[PDB]
Each structure stands twice: as structure tokens, then as C-alpha cells.
Design a protein around this ligand. Structure first.
Ligand SMILES: [K+]
Ligand SMILES: [Zn+2]
Ligand SMILES: [Zn+2]
Length: 53
């Protein structure tokens, strides 16, 4: 179900970041700036960042 925002594939799911604000995702290797690992705690996608104040 989860696909990457940048490349639109849902493969290599161990490399797939999952947004804590919605159901969107992103391969760590697709992200810019460089992300060498899935972080702990919370990651927010760009659509969620746009809802912050
Ligand atoms: K939300
Ligand atoms: Zn990707
Ligand atoms: Zn999100």
C-alpha cells in the first residue's frame, strides 16, 4: 500500500520512510538532502510539513 513520493515504487520496503502525519512514504535513497538511515522517532512528509504552524 505505501509508495514513495519521489519515485512512486513501493519496493525495498526496509528503506521506506513512513510519514507519522499521514500514510505517505519515501525511500531514504530518494530523499534529498541525503538520508542514510530510517530515523527513529518521527518523520514528516512535505504535505504534513505544509500543515504546521
Ligand atoms: K496530520
Ligand atoms: Zn523512491
Ligand atoms: Zn505526511
Amino acid at each position: 500500500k505505501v509508495t514513495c513520493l519521489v519515485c512512486r515504487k513501493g519496493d525495498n520496503d526496509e528503506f521506506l520512510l513512513l510519514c507519522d502525519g499521514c500514510d505517505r512514504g519515501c525511500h531514504i535513497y530518494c530523499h534529498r538532502p541525503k538520508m542514510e538511515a530510517v530515523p527513529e522517532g518521527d518523520w514528516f512528509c512535505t504535505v504534513c510539513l505544509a500543515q504546521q504552524v
